[PDB]
Amino acid sequence: AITCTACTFTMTDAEFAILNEGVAAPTIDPRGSFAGLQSLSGAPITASASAGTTTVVVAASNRNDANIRTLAQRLRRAAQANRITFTA
Amino acid sequence: LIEDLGAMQSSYDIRQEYTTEAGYALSRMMDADILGLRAAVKGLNNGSEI
Amino acid sequence: DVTGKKGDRFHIPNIGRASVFDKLPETPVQLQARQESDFYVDIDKYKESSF
Amino acid sequence: DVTGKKGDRFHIPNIGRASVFDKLPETPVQLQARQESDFYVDIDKYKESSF
Amino acid sequence: DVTGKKGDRFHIPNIGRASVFDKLPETPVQLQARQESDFYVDIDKYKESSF
Amino acid sequence: ALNNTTYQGSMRGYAVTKSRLDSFIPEVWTGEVLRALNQNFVASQYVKTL
């Protein structure tokens, strides 16, 4: 009965566009770093924009350990490759 | 185009997979273009459509 | 079989499908890159029968 | 064919099926033992026709 | 030196300090187990000088 | 039954289980790849090829 209730990451629009291959918040570019997550029910990763801030979360029924680990790994790799700071 | 960094860090032969997939995609494109002539057959209007 | 392999999780990357584009005169080719997924399998069942 | 045998009861033990249990951390294996029943058959019919 | 090694991240497990007990007569030994951390180092700097 | 609690046991302390060896158990990339299924490509054989 172990569940993950929140896996949320916060970014700015510029950095998200850098890591989404220049595509804006609402959709996920297939060539970007947010594509390839395993889909248990629909889109595993969703992104929203508000006041210049982009929120990237794992979907409600896709929050298994593998998706969380892959998202964290891809965020770290993209930040290091693109000289972005992954603050704790 | 395959970067040197990803090629040396990866434990797989990225170039071979990409080359094989490129060949497969080209064959698929040839056959899809051949099968797209059904539209031309439909456009003849000589009674070849059922 | 992974008898003797040191590890509990095993990964097998997925291979996608490439694109085909028209080659126009005096225009460079278009390079494709795909973000691939992976498959993972764990060692999670350890069963015993003893007497 | 017990024409050459001497007893009146004949016993055949039954064997059940073993169980499979998950081996949990820091827990000893569960030892399994079954108290089995036996199938016994008698020589109880002695029939005759006389004239 | 991981020039002949593949992967971006490299792991080095940490080893803790063990305890020494007295081994009293007619008393079994105390078994010890520790949850150890790990040290991860990433390959992240790619520098170039061209002419 | 082996449920008598009047005898002295021989296990004390903690055991080194595979949940305490988390930092020591790695993830393995065996070198095998999962490739998508190939389609049947028969279209250039039923046309007049020059």
Cα dihedral across residues F13, F19, F23, F26: positive or negative: positive
Q: What method was applied to determine this entry?
A: cryo-EM
Closest CA to C7 of A74, E13, E14, F21: F21
Q: Which residues contact residue F17 at a Cβ distance below 8 angstroms, ignoring those fewer than 6 apart? A: D25, D26, E33
* E15's tokens: 């080893």
Size of interface C-D (CB pairs under 8 A): 25
Chains F and B, touching by 3 or more CB pairs within 8 angstroms = yes
Please say whether the beta carbons of C50 and C18 come within 8 A: no
Residues of D at the F interface, defined by Cβ within 8 angstroms: 25-26, 31
CB contact under 8 A, C50 and D33: no
Cβ-based burial of A11 (10 A; exposed 0-12, middle 13-18, buried ≥19):
buried
Whole-number Cα distances in Å, A88 to A46, A70, A72, A76, E10: 21, 17, 12, 11, 20
Q: Which of B24, B26, B35, B41 to mutate to test the interface with F (most CBs of F within 10 A)?
A: B24
CB contact under 8 A, F17 and D31: no
Size of interface B-C (CB pairs under 8 A): 19
Report how far residue C44's alpha carbon sits from residue C9's, in angstroms, rounded to the nearest whole number. 9
Residue of chain A whose alpha carbon sits nearest to that of C40: A66
Cβ-based burial of B22 (10 A; exposed 0-12, middle 13-18, buried ≥19):
middle
b/e map A39-48, b = 16+ CB within 10 Å: eeeeebbbbe
Please say whether the beta carbons of B9 and A80 come within 8 A: no
Closest CA to A45 of A22, A16, A18, A12: A16
Report how far residue F22's alpha carbon sits from residue F19's, in angstroms, rounded to the nearest whole number. 6
CB contact under 8 A, E8 and B9: yes
Instruction: Please state the φ and ψ torsions of residue C39, each to the nearest 5 degrees.
Output: -115, 140
Closest CA to C7 of F18, A64, E14: F18
Cβ-based burial of C47 (10 A; exposed 0-12, middle 13-18, buried ≥19):
exposed
Q: Are strands C38-42 and D9-13 parallel, antiparallel or unpaired?
A: unpaired
CB contact under 8 A, F28 and C11: yes
Among the partner residues C45, C47, C50, nearest to D32 by beta-carbon distance: C50
Would you call F17 an interface residue with chain D, using a CB distance cutoff of 8 Å?
Answer: yes
Please say whether the beta carbons of D25 and C49 come within 8 A: no
Report how far residue B22's alpha carbon sits from residue C19's, in angstroms, rounded to the nearest whole number. 8
Residue of chain B whose alpha carbon sits nearest to that of F45: B31
CB contact under 8 A, E6 and B5: no
Report how far residue B21's alpha carbon sits from residue F33's, in angstroms, rounded to the nearest whole number. 13
Report how far residue A67's alpha carbon sits from residue A74's, in angstroms, rounded to the nearest whole number. 10
CA angle at A8 for the pair A75 and A81, rounded to the nearest 5°: 10
Which residues from chain F sit within 8 angstroms of residue D31, using beta carbons? 2
Report how far residue E7's alpha carbon sits from residue B9's, in angstroms, rounded to the nearest whole number. 5
Report how far residue B49's alpha carbon sits from residue C5's, in angstroms, rounded to the nearest whole number. 61
Amino acid symbol at C38: D
Would you call F40 an interface residue with chain B, using a CB distance cutoff of 8 Å?
Answer: no
CB contact under 8 A, E46 and B5: yes
Would you call E43 an interface residue with chain B, using a CB distance cutoff of 8 Å?
Answer: yes
Which residues from chain F sit within 8 angstroms of residue D25, using beta carbons? 15, 17-19
The three-state secondary structure class of A67 is helix
Residue of chain D whose alpha carbon sits nearest to that of F18: D25
Please say whether the beta carbons of D33 and D15 come within 8 A: no
Amino acid symbol at E51: F
